[model samples]
Target: PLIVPYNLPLPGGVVPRMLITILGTVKPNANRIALDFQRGNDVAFHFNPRFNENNRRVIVCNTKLDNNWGREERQSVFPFESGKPFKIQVLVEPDHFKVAVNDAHLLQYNHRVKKLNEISKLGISGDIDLTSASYTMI
Candidate 1:
């Protein structure tokens, strides 16, 4: 399996009531996984789940503009396990993004990039094997 970063185009772009699903398996001894919602080179939402960093479990959410990362929202709970297949669902809302891991709510990231439709790309990377990535309009 190719363990490389994937860039996927968002159909009609992201808007309120869109759901993005990522299905993948985490590698044993995985360091981290990053799911990025991007527009051009700017990252609107950067969702990084860290397993091994600082010997802690955390989900860091942030935004990147002009290549600079904004304040990170580090929450102290994680729903992922190494060497296991997982499903991540991102629900686009009018004011925030609600994320779920394996059908359980994980966290919410409020829009730093106010216009959701401006995010036209989905990028996935890090220590995991991707099975399928999909988007559905609600």
Candidate 2:
């Protein structure tokens, strides 16, 4: 489980197109893990993997500002498991972000914010043993 939020500064911030990768392991009793592309108090992208819920598993995508959360987009296909290592990749496109898990294409979310580079901070939290995080502009 994470005791502190992992905050990283994007070299030149997220460009029009880029790829972000995250490697981590879910805790045995994990409930959820959240990865966010942020700029101060504004979150351009919020990616969350939930392991325990009435629906069992899901991936939730959204955006936030201050303390208000936008409508959530929940995907039902779960490619992550409790107590196991996983890889998640988010490919930022000019109009949307394509997400994949373990090399398999998952889903895409349209940009909620117009400027991509404004998202310069990467924040991670919740029940996860984060190993590494990287980003590359495409």
Candidate 3:
């Protein structure tokens, strides 16, 4: 069984034409969950979904270099509902990431970190349970 806060490195690092898929369900009173694309110690892309009272439901994306975070790119879309099923797919592109949720094409995050292959690991954490996670290029 897959555990929460799962951290894994891809066999050959992340490259273009790959698809990163996540199937999961959020907890009833979830606060936040992050799906970060790591470039060794730094973060290439931090895809985070937040469910809190203040910002309500928002998806905040950014990059963290040398422990210092970059600008936050917030998307005001609420697709991950509490106790509900969800399907998330991140299509790795030459220039950006195409993000879809529950069969709906949601958003796109352009490349902040130039080297795609350097995005080696994927770190998932907090407030959710994953049915499965995959990174495929077939």
Candidate 4:
């Protein structure tokens, strides 16, 4: 797949909607949040900032995809420490989200997270640490 990239701190009011299939039987009332940062595919990270297990929070990134129509994917995954800062570039294709962080690493995931687009919307309230993140697309 061809590589494409998008910058981060991704302007406010920028969002995408999607459907995700549950990989397994999720507990009742599971707090799942999808984060599309112009990067990653169906990859997700779930944790409880409130120290609640029953109400755990999830961050689903790039989800892998199936080969379709011979089109290349552009989305990917990038990770950094809370106090660490780096540049991330994500290319989005119809099937997947391939991403690269500062051109050092690459990862891929699908575009959606649930069956009925279970999770949508990229960054959420203070969920993304922008003060520590900066980027530009080329």
Candidate 5:
């Protein structure tokens, strides 16, 4: 039972070739799991997976600037089932972020915020129990 609505500081921010790993289990009656890459009041990437809500099983990706959320990119593969564990890998490229779940390719979201190095935080929340999280910028 790790803390929810947690924010991890990224001292040097993010960069190209960086990789982020997250491990967690979807809680029973889970509605969704959201992971955010943020930069000073701005969310560069919002990775959300919804399990229910009008039977909407899909992943919604988006960004926010100046506290205003941008467009939503919706896609589906429904990787993590409720009450099941999951592994998420986020790869930072020059122009986009490649996401995968359970080693399966999920989606790619183009950079809405060009300055990746300014991304100072990783925000995690939603209906899930976090096991571990790591950021590798090698």
Candidate 6:
């Protein structure tokens, strides 16, 4: 598994949800690995005030299947133990927070903070691999 030795802390009362989307072939539409606080894992997915009417943050991972055009029905959960490390970097903007993972990717999930001022600490858990994980509020 990829190793991210750093301990990334979330702001207090802020519940973060992770969405994993996978695409194995062109014939079939992509499938999403979704979980939320309403489901007992994390927060729900929704459109935020900063979001445009039609724009959204979607996750996509380019896999080995990109080279194997003949393969079909090959599917697996994200954060694969043997694959490349998954990364996440967050930037808190004036209007909204922008989170990017593994270079040109963003982690977009529904908000869990109702007061917007309750977020001060973060907690993370799972078997997902990582090369690095950290965040700053500035």
State the lDDT of candidate 5 residue by residue for 16-97, as single tens digits.
Answer: 8889998888899999889999988889999999888587798889999888888899996778899999999999999899
Which candidate number has the best lDDT?
1
Candidate 3, lDDT over the whole model: 0.87
Among all windows of 10 consecutive residues in model 4, the one with the lowest summed lDDT is 18-27
Q: How far is each candidate from the true structure, as Cα RMSD in Å?
A: 1.3, 2.0, 1.2, 13.8, 1.2, 14.0
Tens digits of per-residue lDDT for model 4 on 95-132? 65455555554565554433323322343222233323
- What is the model-wide C-alpha lDDT for candidate 1? 0.90
What is candidate 6's lDDT per residue for 1-138, written digit by digit as tens?
Answer: 223222233444333342222111111121222211111222322211111123432333211222322211221222321223444444443334344534554433323334434444333333333333344333
Q: After TM-score superposition, what is the CA distance of residue 54 in candidate 6 from its true location, in Å?
A: 26
Misplaced by over 4 Å in model 2 are: 1-4
Compared with the true structure, model 1 gives a TM-score of 0.95
Of the two candidates 1 and 5, the one with more favorable lDDT, higher being better, is: 1
lDDT of model 4 at position 138: 30
Candidate 2 lDDT, 1-138, residue by residue in tens: 334368877876787567888888888988888888887788999988888778579888999977799999999998888899999888877788898999999999998877777788889888889888878776
Structure candidate 1, residue pairs in collision:
none
In angstroms, how far off is 77's CA in candidate 4?
9.5
TM-score of each: 0.95, 0.90, 0.94, 0.33, 0.94, 0.36
Please, what are the lDDT tens digits per residue for candidate 1 over residues 7-95?
88996679888999989999999999999999888999999999977788888999999999999999898899999999999999988
Model 3, 1-138: lDDT tens per residue?
A: 579989877766777789888888888888998999998889888989889848578899999999999999999987888888788898888889899998899899999888777788899898898889988884
